[PDB]
Design a protein around this ligand. Structure first.
Ligand SMILES: [Mg+2]
Ligand SMILES: [Zn+2]
Lengths: 50, 1340, 51, 102, 455
DNA sequence: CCCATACTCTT
DNA sequence: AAGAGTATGGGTG
C-alpha cells in the first residue's frame, strides 16, 4: 500500500525482491535463446536474392 | 559516552529504534573455521585430529607390525606475513607428527610386543591464515570462498508429470552420503519400484533386498500385512475387521451374525462400519469365488504328498481352493491390498524381478556395475560389501546421520557412518507411503536442506585425500620384513601431502586473488557464498528455481546483492547477523517475547526452527516496559505474513538491517529505491578507486566505522597509552602502567604501509591521524588506510549538483563536470605497475646485469647507476632502459674480419649481446622502488647491499628504542641505590652514567646491590646484541629461486590519472554515467551569491528508474552543508565558545524522538573547538536503511540552516546571465570514480603481428591486436549489399599474405586498388581435411 | 631429427634456401638436392604444404 | 591454444624497405638476391659475381649490381649490406654533416 | 616455446608419437614371429591409437594428458564453435580497426562523427606516409616513418588533409539488424572518446554509461563509394523492417519542443498582434513576452500545386509565441497546423514523416538537425528539474485503504462464520484490493494533471 | 530437450 | 508375422 515517496518497510521490500530477481534472470537468460532463433532464420534464407 | 576517535567528529543520527544487539565481528566465518581446523582437539571430530584418526593405525597384511599415530604439532613460521609478502614466499607452518612403529611376535597369544619405536616426522607445510582472514600464497593475498552445497541425508522428490505424456507424476528417493556411492529408488508408470546404483542401468528394486539375505516370505511380511481365510465348512469363512471394508463396494449381500449390514450393489457406509464395530463382527461368509484374484503370502505343502502346492506371492484360483480344501488346510494367508492405498507395488515388482535367491542378485549387481568381464561369487560379495558397508569407502557423516534420522522420524541423533538393512527398509517404506498419498515431498531450495562449507572443512578433506595416498604407499612398502632397522621416517614420504595441500591452496576453483579496490571490496569478498565449485552446480545447467529468492533467505542471505548475468542467483552475500550451526546451517537471532513482554533474550534460530513460530517485525511500536502498543501486529508464521494478536507473538527481529548485507546497508534511503537499481548500486559501490584525499560521505547510514575497522586496513591501538612519537611512517605509543607485563619496556611500534602496489595496480598508503602527546585507548584508530577518513569508510567525494538539462551534454546518462573539479584534483588517482628482469644461466656462460652495454650511447646510460639499475626517482618513458643485461653470444672461429673488429673496437662488444629490460611503449611514470633477489651462493652487487643496509637500520632503531628505555630504568635504579650512602648529588650528576658502575661502597648490601645491577646491565646488553644478530641473519638470508635462475630485479613505476571525458562515474543508488565534457567555470549555472555548481545531472533519468533515494540524499546533503556553513561563518569571525556550543547543541537536538543523546556540557572548551573545527565543511548525518529520516525532519534541518524548504533555488546561465525559468533542485551528492578508465579502453591498429598457423591478426590490446568481424557483421554487410567492403575485410585485411603487401604498397603509392587471393585459413582447412583420409580438392 | 615428425628431408628446409648440413646456402643453388643431408634448397614456407 | 606469433627479422625489414622503393623488375630481382645474401650482422656474405651469376640473365653488367647495392646500403640501419668494415665505416661517415669537428 | 628452454609438446604431436610407437612395436613383433596372444593385444592398441588420433572420445573413453583434460584431435580442430569454419572462415580479426568508449556530441551533424586524433594517426598511417612522400617533405619511407614517430607539427596538417572526405564505419556489438554498422565522416577531436550523434543512438541501442564501439577504415575506391552511397547515416532514415523513420527525437529534444509549444491562461504579453515570427523572437529575447502567451501572428505558408509548384498564402493565426518561433525552422511546403499544438513524441515523428513524404530526403535531414538543436536549446532554457514535492499523494488514499481493509475484515469474519469457502474468499479479497488500487490510481492521476490559475 | 533406432508386447 | 510402444544414444544450447 506504500509508494516510493513514502517508503517501504522490510516485509514489502522483501516481497518485491522476488519479482525483481525473476525479471532480471529472465532478461539475462533469454539473450542466449534469441540468438539461436536468428541464426536458424539466417541459415534457412541465406541464398534468397531478387 | 564516546571514544577518543569518535569524539573528534560525531555523526548526527536520525535512527529512532534502540539497538539490542551490536553488529558482530564481520570476519568470524573465516576465522572460526580455520581455528576449528587447526586447533588441538581432544576428540576426533574436527580438524587434523579427525583426519589422522580416520586413517591410522595402518596395519600390514601379515599383522606382525603396524604404525600408530600419537599426536601432531605445528612449528613457528620462519618469516612474518610482511616478510613473506616482500620476499614472495608462502606464509606457512611445519607439521611435526609423532608416529610409533610396533612389532608383533609370531606363535604367541595375540601379538607380543617385540619392539616399539617412536619417531617425530615432518609431514610438510600448512599455510596459515592472517588476522584479517587471508592467506599469503607466493607473496600474494588470497581468499577461499565458502560453498553452499546439498546436505547429506535422504531426499524424497517427484517429477511434475513431465517425463510421461499421460501427466502422471513419478516419485523417487535418493541417499546422498558425504563420501561414497549414491543410492536411488524410483517409480515407473507401471507402479513398480526400481533401484539405481551411482546413476547406472536400472534394476528391479528387490535385487538389493535379496542381496541382504531376505526370503520372499519375509519381504511380503515386511511390505504387506496378512488376512486369514479358514476352511470352516461354510465356503472359507474369513476373519475380518470392519475397518478393512472401508473404501470398497459390496460384491454381494454383506450379512454377519444374523444382521444384514450391507446389501449387494450398495457401497459400505461409515455407519455400517460403526455398526460392525459395535457388534464385534469376526466371522464372515463369502463365496468360493472370493479368492479369484487374491494373492497368497506363504507356502503350504500337503503333509501326505510332501510337495509344494502353491508358490509364495501367487494369485489363487477356485481349483487351488479345491486342492487345499481336500488336504484340510484350514489356514490361508492373503495380502490386504486396496486401490486407494496399500498398493501391490512390492508384490508386482517381486513378480517382475527375475532372481529368486540370494546368490544371483550379487551376480546381477556385479554385472551391472562391472560389465565386460565374467562374474565371480567372491568378487560380487566383496563389491557389495565395499559398496555401502565399508567404513573405508562410504561415510554418512554426522550431519548426514542427523538428517537421515530426522527425515525418518527417528528418536536418536547419533549413529554409525554406514547404511544398514533397516535404513534401506525404512527408506523404501517411506517412499511407498509417499506413493500412497500419506506424506509430502521435500523442497530442495529450502535453506534447511542446503549447507555451508568453509575453508577449514575443505582443507581437512584435501589433507585426508593426501593421507590415504600416503597410507597406501606405506602399506605397499611395509610388506618387506625389515623391522629390525627400519624407521617411520624412511617409510613415509611427505611429497604427496604437501603437493595436495599446495594444489588446494593455489589452484582451487574457490581460491582467488583478493579483490583490493577498497576495504568494502575485501569485506564483501571474504563474506561471499558460492553454489559453484567441486561438488556444486554449473551456470549452464542450473535452472530458474535455484536462482530465486526463497522465504527461508530472510535474515540469512541478502536478497539484493547478487551479480547480474550468467551467475545471477548463484553468488550470494551473507547477511549482517547471520551465523552457522555446528552442523553448518545458517541461523539468525531473534528476541524472545514472554507473555506479551519483549525481553533482551537472544535466540539464534535456523530455517527449520523458524517456521514453527510466530515472529513479529522490527517495525513494531513498544511501550517503555516492552508492551506492543497495538493489539494486532504483522508477523510471519509459516512462510507467509499476516496480522496476529498480541498474545500469539513468539519472537521479534533484533534490527531493521537484519535482512540486508554489509554492502546494501551502506545505501542511504534504500527504502525509496527500486530493487533493480539497488542491486546495481550495491554492485557498483565495490569497484570505486581511492583518490588522493579521502572525504567522508556527509550522508551515511552508520555502518562506515564498522567496515573501516573490521577490514584491517587501518592501524588500531593494541593497548592504551600516550603517543610518544608520531611521524609520516611510524608511530610509537608509550603503554599505560596498568596494561604492562612484568619485566618489559612498555612501548608499541606501528610501521605504516607507504605507497604499495595492490592486486589491481592501485595504491595502498596509510597516514597518521593522531598528534604528538595525545592519549589513546585500546581499539582507537591510529592511522587511516585507503578510502578511510578518521576511521570511517570514504569511497568518494561530495559534489554540488543540479538536476537540469544543459544543451544536450547530459543526454542519455551523460555527465557534465566543472573545470574546478579537475583543478582541485578531487578525482585524481595513483596507479603502480611492476616490471621484472630475470638473469639466468646458459650453456655458453651466465647472463650478467651490467651498465656496460657496448652498442648504446652515453645518454641512454645516464639514468643507470654503477650496477646497471635505474635510480630511484627517475622519470622514464617508452623505450628507456631500466635494467642493463647482456647475453653471452658464444665463441666463434675468429676469422680475420672478426679479429679486425675486435682489435679496432674491443673485446666486450664481440662476446655479448644486449638483452636489457625496457619500458613498454605507451607507459611512463616515476621509479619509486627496486627489489633485487639473488640466489644463495652468488655474489651480491652494491644495490643489494644498499637495500640490506637500509633494511637493517630500521630494525636497529626499533631495538634501540627498547634498549634505551630499559637502560634508563636500570640506571635510575643504580642512582637511587648509590645516593643512599655516599651521596654526591651534583658531583654524581657531573659524572657520566657509565662511571657509576666503577664507584663502590662498604661491604654491606651497598655493594651487593650494585654488583647485581651491573650483572643485570651486562645481561641486557648481551640479550639485545643477540637480538640484533638474529635480525641481521634473518635479513641477510639468500633467496631460493627457480632452477637455472641467477637473479631477479623488480622495478615499480607510479603514475597519476586525472579525470577526463570518457571516464565512468556513479552514485550509490544505481545512477551511473560517463563524463561528456569538462566545462569552464564561467559557463556553469550559478546562484544569487555567484556560487557555481560542480555537476549537472539529467532529471529525465529519475522517473523511469524509480530510484528516489538520490533526490532525498541531495536534499539532506544540502541541509548538512548549510549547517556546516553556519558553523564556518561563526568560526571565521572569532566568537565565544558559548555561542558555538549552543548552536551545535541545537543542531544535535533536532529530530522527533531520536535514540541519540549528545550533551556538550561534559565537553571541555578545547574539545568543543576541535569538534567545531571538524564540522566546518558540513555536519555528517546517519540514516539507517529502514529507520531513516523523514521529509519533515529534512525540512526542519533545512530551516535551521536558513535554506528553502522545497530544496529548489533560482539559477542563472553562466553564458548569458539570464535566469532559468523554473527553480532547480541543487544540493550535494556522494560520487564515486569507477575502475573503467578510458586510458585502458582506447586502442587502434594499422598493421602488426599475426598468428603462425592462421596468419590472422592477434587479439587483445596487450598484443596490439585487431577487432573481430564476426558473423553478424557479415550478415549486416550482406544486407547492405556492400560486396567490395566485405571482400576487402575478408582477404587483404586478415589473411591474404600477398594481398596485404600489395595493398600496403598501392596505398603508399596513392593507388586505391586491391588484388584479392585465397585466404590462408582455407588452405589450412584443406590440409586438415586431407589429413583425415578424405580427398578434397579444387576443380578447374 | 632425421625421419622424425619435423624432418627437413621430408617436409623442407628450416631456413630459406639452405640445406640442413650447410653445403648449399644461396639463391644460386635454388632447386638443388644436397647429397649429404637430402634437403632441397628452396623457401622455408613449403613446410606449410608438404604432408 | 596459443600458436605463437610472427617476428620481424633484419631481412624482413630490408624486404619491407625494398618493396616500397621505386625499383624496376630487374632491379627488384637484384635487390632480392642481395638481401638474401645479407647475414645477421648486416654484412654481405658473397662477392657480387655470385649475385650476378644467380640473377641468371646475360644482359646485365656488374655496374647495375653496384648501383643497386649502393642504394640498398642507405636503408635503415645505415651501413647494412657492407662488403667489409672499411666500407661500413665509410658509408656511416658519408651521412654525417660537414660541421663535425674531425 | 617457453622461457627456460622448454618446448613442451602439443596434443597432435603426442597422438602422432603414440601411433608411431605402436606401429614400430607391432612391426618388430611381427617380424620376430612373436606369439599371437601378444600381437593381438598390440594390434588392438594400434587400432585404439589410430581411433584416438582421428577422433578422440568418439569410441570409448577419451585419452587425456597430465591435466585430466582430453587431447584435441583433427576432428576437434575441424568442427565446433572453436573450429576453422566458425572461428576463422565465417569471421576473423582484421587490420585498420580500433575501439573505445563513446560520448555524446551535441554539435555534430547527422553525417559526422567525432574521432580522436591519436586513434586517427594510427589508423591512417600508410596514407600519411604516401602524402608525406608526395610533397617532398620526406624522401624515403624511413624518413616518413621517423617523422610520424616523432609526431612533428606538419603531420597533423597532413592527417587533416587525408581524412577530409574519407568515411569510416562505426559498429556496436551485438549487431542485430544491419543498422549496427553505419558510415560517418570523421572530425578530429582531442581526448580518447568517440563522439556519437544523438539521433542515431536508437538505431545502435546505445547509451552513454560505459558502451564501447569499434571503428573500421575502408581502403579501396569501391569500398569508400559503398560506404558513402549505401551505409551513410543520411541514407538510412527509414526502417527496413516496417518503413517507419528511425531518427526520431527523444527525451531532451521532445521535452524542450513540448515545453516551448504550450499555452498558459494569463502569461506576460498575452493578447497582442505580431507582424511575424521574428517579432515574436525579438519579444521573447527582450523579456517583454512569455513563451506561452496566446497572441495573433501573421503567417505565410506554402502549398504544392497540381503541377508541382509552391503557392503562398498569408493570414492571421491565433497561436502562441513559442509556436511562431518554432515555425521558422519548418521548410516550405508544410501547413502551419503541423506546429499549432503541443508537440509530443508522436507528433514530432509524424511531422518528420510528413516532411519526408512531401519534400524528400535532404530537407528531412536538415529539418531533423534543426529540430534537435532547437529542442536542446529550449530544454536547457526551461530549467526543468525534479524534486520531492513533485510527487503529489492524493488526499483520499488513506480513506480508500481504510475502506478496503474494513471490507477485507468483514469478509474474513464472514468466512470465520462459515458462509463461504477458501477459494471464493481469496478471489474476493483479490478483487477488493484490485478495485481499491484502481480507485487510488484514478484519484492520483486526476489530482496530478490539472492546476488552478487566475484569469 | 528433441529426434532417430533396437528391443518388447499385442492383434 | 506385422505394428505400436519404450528404453537408449547423439547433437544442441
Ligand atoms: Mg549502456
Ligand atoms: Zn646439405
Amino acid at each position: 500500500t506504500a509508494n516510493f515517496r513514502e517508503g517501504l518497510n522490510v516485509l514489502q521490500y522483501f516481497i518485491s525482491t522476488h519479482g525483481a530477481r525473476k525479471g532480471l534472470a529472465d532478461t539475462a537468460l533469454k539473450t542466449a535463446n534469441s540468438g539461436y532463433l536468428t541464426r536458424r532464420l539466417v541459415d534457412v534464407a541465406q541464398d534468397l536474392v531478387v | 559516552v564516546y571514544s577518543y576517535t569518535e569524539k573528534k567528529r560525531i555523526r548526527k543520527d536520525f535512527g529512532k529504534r534502540p539497538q539490542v544487539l551490536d553488529v558482530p565481528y564481520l570476519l568470524s566465518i573465516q576465522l572460526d573455521s580455520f581455528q576449528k581446523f587447526i586447533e588441538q582437539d581432544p576428540e576426533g571430530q574436527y580438524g587434523l585430529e579427525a583426519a589422522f584418526r580416520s586413517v591410522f593405525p595402518i596395519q600390514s597384511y601379515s599383522g606382525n607390525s603396524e604404525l600408530q599415530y600419537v599426536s601432531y604439532r605445528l612449528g613457528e613460521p620462519v618469516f612474518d606475513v610482511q616478510e613473506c609478502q616482500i620476499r614472495g614466499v608462502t606464509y606457512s607452518a611445519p607439521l611435526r607428527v609423532k608416529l610409533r612403529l610396533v612389532i608383533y611376535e609370531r606363535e604367541a597369544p595375540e601379538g607380543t610386543v617385540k619392539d616399539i619405536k617412536e619417531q617425530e616426522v615432518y609431514m610438510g607445510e600448512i599455510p596459515l591464515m592472517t588476522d584479517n582472514g587471508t592467506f599469503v600464497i607466493n607473496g600474494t593475498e588470497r581468499v577461499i570462498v565458502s560453498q553452499l552445497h546439498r546436505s547429506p541425508g535422504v531426499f524424497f522428490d517427484s517429477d511434475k508429470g513431465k517425463t510421461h505424456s499421460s501427466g502422471k507424476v513419478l516419485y523417487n528417493a535418493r541417499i546422498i552420503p558425504y563420501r561414497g556411492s549414491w543410492l536411488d529408488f524410483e517409480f515407473d508408470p507401471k507402479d513398480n519400484l526400481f533401484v539405481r546404483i551411482d546413476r547406472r542401468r536400472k534394476l528391479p528394486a528387490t535385487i538389493i533386498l535379496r542381496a541382504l539375505n531376505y526370503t520372499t516370505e519375509q519381504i511380503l511380511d515386511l511390505f504387506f500385512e496378512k488376512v486369514i481365510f479358514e476352511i470352516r465348512d461354510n465356503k472359507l469363512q474369513m476373519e475380518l475387521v470392519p475397518e478393512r471394508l472401508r473404501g470398497e463396494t459390496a460384491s454381494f449381500d454383506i450379512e454377519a451374525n444374523g444382521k444384514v449390514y450391507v446389501e449387494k450393489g450398495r457401497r459400505i457406509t461409515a455407519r455400517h462400519i460403526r455398526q460392525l464395530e459395535k457388534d464385534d463382527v469376526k466371522l464372515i461368509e463369502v463365496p468360493v469365488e472370493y479368492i479369484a484374484g487374491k494373492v497368497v503370502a506363504k507356502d503350504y505343502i500337503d503333509e501326505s504328498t510332501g510337495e509344494l502346492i502353491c508358490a509364495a506371492n501367487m494369485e489363487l484360483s477356485l481349483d487351488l481352493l479345491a486342492k487345499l480344501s481336500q488336504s484340510g488346510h484350514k489356514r490361508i494367508e492373503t495380502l490386504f491390498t486396496n486401490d486407494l492405498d496399500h498398493g501391490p507395488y512390492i508384490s508386482e515388482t517381486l513378480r517382475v524381478d527375475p532372481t529368486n535367491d540370494r546368490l544371483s542378485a550379487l551376480v546381477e549387481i556385479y554385472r551391472m556395475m562391472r560389465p565386460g568381464e565374467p562374474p565371480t561369487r567372491e568378487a560380487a560379495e566383496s563389491l557389495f560389501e565395499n559398496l555401502f558397508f565399508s567404513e573405508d569407502r562410504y561415510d554418512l557423516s554426522a550431519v548426514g546421520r542427523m538428517k537421515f534420522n530426522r527425515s525418518l522420524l527417528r528418536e536418536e541423533i547419533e549413529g554409525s557412518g554406514i547404511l544398514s538393512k533397516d535404513d534401506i527398509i525404512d527408506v523404501m517404506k517411506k517412499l511407498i507411503d509417499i506413493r500412497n498419498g500419506k506424506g509430502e515431498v521435500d523442497d530442495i531450495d529450502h535453506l534447511g536442506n542446503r549447507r555451508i562449507r568453509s575453508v577449514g572443512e575443505m582443507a581437512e578433506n584435501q589433507f585426508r585425500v593426501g593421507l590415504v595416498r600416503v597410507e597406501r604407499a606405506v602399506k605397499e612398502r611395509l610388506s618387506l620384513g625389515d623391522l629390525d632397522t627400519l624407521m617411520p621416517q624412511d617409510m613415509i614420504n611427505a611429497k604427496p601431502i604437501s603437493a595436495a595441500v599446495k594444489e588446494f591452496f593455489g589452484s582451487s576453483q574457490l581460491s582467488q586473488f583478493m579483490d583490493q579496490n577498497n576495504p568494502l571490496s575485501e569485506i564483501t569478498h571474504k563474506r561471499r557464498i558460492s553454489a559453484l565449485g567441486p561438488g556444486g552446480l554449473t551456470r549452464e545447467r542450473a535452472g530458474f528455481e535455484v536462482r530465486d529468492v526463497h522465504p527461508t533467505h530472510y535474515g540469512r542471505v541478502c536478497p539484493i546483492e547478487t551479480p547480474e548475468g550468467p551467475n545471477i542467483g548463484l553468488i550470494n552475500s551473507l547477511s549482517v547477523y547471520a551465523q552457522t550451526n555446528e552442523y553448518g546451517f545458517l541461523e539468525t537471532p531473534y528476541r524472545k517475547v514472554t507473555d506479551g513482554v519483549v525481553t533482551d533474550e537472544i535466540h539464534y534460530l535456523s530455517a527449520i526452527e523458524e517456521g514453527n513460530y510466530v515472529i513479529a517485525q522490527a517495525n513494531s511500536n513498544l511501550d517503555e516496559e516492552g508492551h506492543f502498543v497495538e493489539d494486532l501486529v504483522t508477523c510471519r508464521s509459516k512462510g507467509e505474513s499476516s496480522l496476529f494478536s498480541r498474545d500469539q507473538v513468539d519472537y521479534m527481529d533484533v534490527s531493521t538491517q537484519q535482512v540486508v548485507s554489509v554492502g546494501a546497508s551502506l545505501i542511504p534511503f534504500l527504502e525509496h529505491d527500486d530493487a533493480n537499481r539497488a542491486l546495481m548500486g550495491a554492485n557498483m559501490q565495490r569497484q570505486a578507486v581511492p583518490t588522493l584525499r579521502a572525504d567522508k560521505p556527509l550522508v551515511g547510514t552508520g555502518m562506515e566505522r564498522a567496515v573501516a575497522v573490521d577490514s584491517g586496513v587501518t592501524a588500531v591501538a593494541k593497548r592504551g597509552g600516550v603517543v610518544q612519537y608520531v611521524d609520516a611512517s611510524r608511530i610509537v605509543i608509550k603503554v599505560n602502567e596498568d596494561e604492562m607485563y612484568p619485566g618489559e619496556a612498555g612501548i608499541d611500534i606501528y610501521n605504516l604501509t607507504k605507497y604499495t602496489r595492490s592486486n589491481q595496480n592501485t595504491c595502498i598508503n596509510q597516514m597518521p591521524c593522531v598528534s604528538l602527546g595525545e592519549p589513546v585507548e585500546r581499539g582507537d584508530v591510529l592511522a587511516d588506510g585507503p578510502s578511510t577518513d578518521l576511521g570511517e569508510l570514504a569511497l568518494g567525494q561530495n559534489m554540488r549538483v543540479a538536476f537540469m538539462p544543459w544543451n544536450g551534454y547530459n543526454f542519455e546518462d551523460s555527465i557534465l563536470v566543472s573545470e574546478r573539479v579537475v583543478q582541485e584534483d578531487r578525482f585524481t588517482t595513483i596507479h603502480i605497475q611492476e616490471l621484472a628482469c630475470v638473469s639466468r644461466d646458459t650453456k655458453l656462460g651466465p647472463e650478467e646485469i651490467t651498465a656496460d652495454i657496448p652498442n648504446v650511447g652515453e645518454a641512454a646510460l645516464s639514468k643507470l647507476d654503477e650496477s646497471g639499475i635505474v635510480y630511484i626517482g627517475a622519470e622514464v618513458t617508452g623505450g628507456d632502459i631500466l635494467v642493463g643485461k647482456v647475453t653471452p653470444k658464444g665463441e666463434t672461429q675468429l676469422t680475420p674480419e672478426e679479429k679486425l673488429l675486435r682489435a679496432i673496437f674491443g673485446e666486450k662488444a664481440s662476446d655479448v649481446k644486449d638483452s636489457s629490460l625496457r619500458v613498454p611503449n605507451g607507459v611512463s611514470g616515476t621509479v619509486i622502488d627496486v627489489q633485487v633477489f639473488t640466489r644463495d651462493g652468488v655474489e651480491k652487487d652494491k644495490r643489494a647491499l644498499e637495500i640490506e643496509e637500509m633494511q637493517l637500520k630500521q630494525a636497529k632503531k626499533d631495538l634501540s628504542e627498547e634498549l634505551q628505555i630499559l637502560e634508563a630504568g636500570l640506571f635510575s635504579r643504580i642512582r637511587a641505590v648509590l645516593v643512599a650512602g655516599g651521596v654526591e648529588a651534583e658531583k654524581l650528576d657531573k659524572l657520566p652514567r657509565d662511571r657509576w658502575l666503577e664507584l663502590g661502597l662498604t661491604d654491606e648490601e651497598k655493594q651487593n646491590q650494585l654488583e647485581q645491577l651491573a650483572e643485570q646491565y651486562d645481561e641486557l646488553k648481551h640479550e639485545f646484541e643477540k637480538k640484533l644478530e638474529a635480525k641481521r641473519r634473518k635479513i641477510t638470508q639468500g633467496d631460493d629461486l627457480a632452477p637455472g635462475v641467477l637473479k631477479i630485479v623488480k622495478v615499480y613505476l607510479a603514475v597519476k590519472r586525472r579525470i577526463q571525458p570518457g571516464d565512468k562515474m556513479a552514485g550509490r543508488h544505481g545512477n551511473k554515467g560517463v563524463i561528456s565534457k569538462i566545462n569552464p567555470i564561467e559557463d556553469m549555472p550559478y546562484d544569487e551569491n555567484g556560487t557555481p555548481v560542480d555537476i549537472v545531472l539529467n532529471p529525465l533519468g529519475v522517473p523511469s528508474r524509480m530510484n528516489i533515494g538520490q533526490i532525498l540524499e541531495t536534499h539532506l546533503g544540502m541541509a548538512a552543508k548549510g549547517i556546516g556553513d553556519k558553523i564556518n561563518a561563526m568560526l571565521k569571525q572569532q566568537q565565544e565558545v558559548a555561542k558555538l556550543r549552543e548552536f551545535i547543541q541545537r543542531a544535535y537536538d533536532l529530530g522527533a524522538d531520536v535514540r541519540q543523546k549528545v550533551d556538550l556540557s561534559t565537553f571541555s572548551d578545547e574539545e568543543v573547538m576541535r569538534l567545531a573545527e571538524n564540522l566546518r565543511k558540513g555536519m555528517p548525518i546517519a540514516t539507517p536503511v529502514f529507520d531513516g529520516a523523514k521529509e519533515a525532519e529534512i525540512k526542519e534541518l533545512l530551516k535551521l540552516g536558513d535554506l528553502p524548504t522545497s530544496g529548489q533555488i533560482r539559477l542563472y546561465d553562466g553564458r548569458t546571465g539570464e535566469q532559468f525559468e523554473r527553480p532547480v533542485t541543487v544540493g550535494y551528492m556522494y560520487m564515486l570514480k569507477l575502475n573503467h578508465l578510458v586510458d585502458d579502453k582506447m586502442h587502434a591498429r594499422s598493421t602488426g603481428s599475426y598468428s603462425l598457423v592462421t596468419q590472422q591478426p592477434l587479439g587483445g590490446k596487450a598484443q596490439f591486436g585487431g577487432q573481430r568481424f564476426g558473423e553478424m557483421e557479415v550478415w549486416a554487410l550482406e544486407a547492405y549489399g556492400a560486396a567490395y567492403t566485405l571482400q576487402e575485410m575478408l582477404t587483404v585485411k586478415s589473411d591474404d599474405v600477398n594481398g596485404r603487401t600489395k595493398m600496403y604498397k598501392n596505398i603508399v603509392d596513392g593507388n586505391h586498388q586491391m588484388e584479392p587471393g585465397m585466404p590462408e585459413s582455407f588452405n589450412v582447412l584443406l590440409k586438415e581435411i586431407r589429413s583425415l583420409g578424405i580427398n578434397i580438392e579444387l576443380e578447374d | 631429427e632425421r625421419d622424425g615428425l619435423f624432418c627437413a628431408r621430408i617436409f623442407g628446409p628450416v631456413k630459406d634456401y639452405e640445406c640442413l648440413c650447410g653445403k648449399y646456402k644461396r639463391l644460386k643453388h635454388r632447386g638443388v638436392i644436397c647429397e649429404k643431408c637430402g634437403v632441397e634448397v628452396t623457401q622455408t614456407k613449403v613446410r606449410r604444404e608438404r604432408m | 591454444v596459443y600458436q605463437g606469433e610472427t617476428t620481424q627479422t633484419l631481412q624482413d625489414y630490408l624486404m619491407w624497405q625494398v618493396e616500397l622503393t621505386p625499383f624496376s623488375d630487374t632491379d627488384r630481382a637484384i635487390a632480392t638476391s642481395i638481401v638474401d645474401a645479407v647475414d645477421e650482422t648486416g654484412y654481405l656474405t658473397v662477392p657480387l659475381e655470385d649475385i650476378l651469376e644467380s640473377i641468371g640473365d646475360e644482359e646485365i653488367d656488374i655496374d647495375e649490381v653496384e648501383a643497386v647495392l649502393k642504394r640498398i646500403q642507405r636503408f635503415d640501419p645505415v651501413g647494412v649490406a657492407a662488403k667489409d668494415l672499411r666500407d661500413c665505416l665509410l658509408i656511416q661517415l658519408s651521412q654525417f654533416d660537414k660541421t663535425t669537428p674531425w | 616455446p617457453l622461457d627456460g628452454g622448454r618446448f613442451a609438446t602439443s596434443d597432435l604431436n603426442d597422438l602422432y608419437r603414440r601411433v608411431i610407437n605402436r606401429n614400430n612395436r607391432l612391426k618388430r613383433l611381427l617380424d620376430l614371429a612373436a606369439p599371437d596372444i601378444i600381437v593381438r593385444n598390440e594390434k588392438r592398441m594400434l587400432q585404439e591409437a589410430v581411433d584416438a588420433l582421428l577422433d578422440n572420445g568418439r569410441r570409448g573413453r577419451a585419452i587425456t594428458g597430465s591435466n585430466k583434460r582430453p587431447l584435441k584431435s583433427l576432428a576437434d580442430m575441424i568442427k565446433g564453435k572453436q573450429g576453422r569454419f566458425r572461428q576463422n572462415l565465417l569471421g576473423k580479426r582484421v587490420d585498420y580497426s580500433g575501439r573505445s568508449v563513446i560520448t555524446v556530441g551535441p554539435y555534430l551533424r547527422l553525417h559526422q562523427c567525432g574521432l580522436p586524433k591519436k586513434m586517427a594517426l594510427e589508423l591512417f598511417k600508410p596514407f600519411i606516409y604516401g602524402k608525406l612522400e608526395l610533397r617532398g617533405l620526406a624522401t624515403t619511407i624511413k624518413a616518413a616513418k621517423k617523422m610520424v614517430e616523432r609526431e612533428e607539427a606538419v603531420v597533423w596538417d597532413i592527417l587533416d588533409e587525408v581524412i577530409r572526405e574519407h568515411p569510416v564505419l562505426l559498429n556496436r556489438a551485438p549487431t542485430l539488424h544491419r543498422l549496427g554498422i553505419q558510415a560517418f565522416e570523421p572530425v578530429l577531436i582531442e581526448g580518447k572518446a568517440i563522439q556519437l550523434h544523438p539521433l542515431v543512438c536508437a538505431a545502435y541501442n546505445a547509451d552513454f554509461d560505459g558502451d564501447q564501439m569499434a571503428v573500421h577504415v575502408p581502403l579501396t575506391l569501391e569500398a569508400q563509394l559503398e560506404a558513402r552511397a549505401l551505409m551513410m547515416s543520411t541514407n538510412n532514415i527509414l526502417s527496413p523492417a516496417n518503413g517507419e523513420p528511425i531518427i526520431v527525437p527523444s527525451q531532451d529534444v521532445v521535452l524542450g519542443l513540448y515545453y516551448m509549444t504550450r499555452d498558459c491562461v494569463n502569461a506576460k504579453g498575452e493578447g497582442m498582434v505580431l507582424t511575424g515570427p521574428k517579432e515574436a523572437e525579438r519579444l521573447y529575447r527582450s523579456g517583454l513576452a512569455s513563451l506561452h502567451a496566446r497572441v495573433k501572428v501573421r503567417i505565410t505558408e506554402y502549398e504544392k500545386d497540381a503541377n508541382g509548384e509552391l503557392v503562398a498564402k498569408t493570414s492571421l493565426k491565433d497561436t502562441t509565441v513559442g509556436r511562431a518561433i518554432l515555425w521558422m525552422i519548418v521548410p516550405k511546403g508544410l501547413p502551419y497546423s503541423i506546429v499549432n499544438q503541443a508537440l509530443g513524441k508522436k507528433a514530432i515523428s509524424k511531422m518528420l514523416n510528413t516532411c519526408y513524404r512531401i519534400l524528400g530526403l535532404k530537407p528531412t535531414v536538415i529539418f531533423a538537425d534543426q529540430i534537435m538543436y532547437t529542442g536542446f536549446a529550449y530544454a536547457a532554457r526551461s530549467g526543468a528539474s525534479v524534486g520531492i514535492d513533485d510527487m503529489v499523494i492524493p488526499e483520499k488514499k488513506h480513506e480508500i485503504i481504510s475502506e478496503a481493509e474494513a471490507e477485507v475484515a468483514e469478509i474474513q469474519e464472514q468466512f470465520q462464520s462459515g458462509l463461504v469457502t477458501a477459494g471464493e474468499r481469496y478471489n474476493k479479497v483479490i478483487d477488493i484490493w484490485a478495485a481499491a488500487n484502481d480507485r487510488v490510481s484514478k484519484a492520483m492521476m486526476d489530482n496530478l494533471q490539472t492546476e488552478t490559475v487566475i484569469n
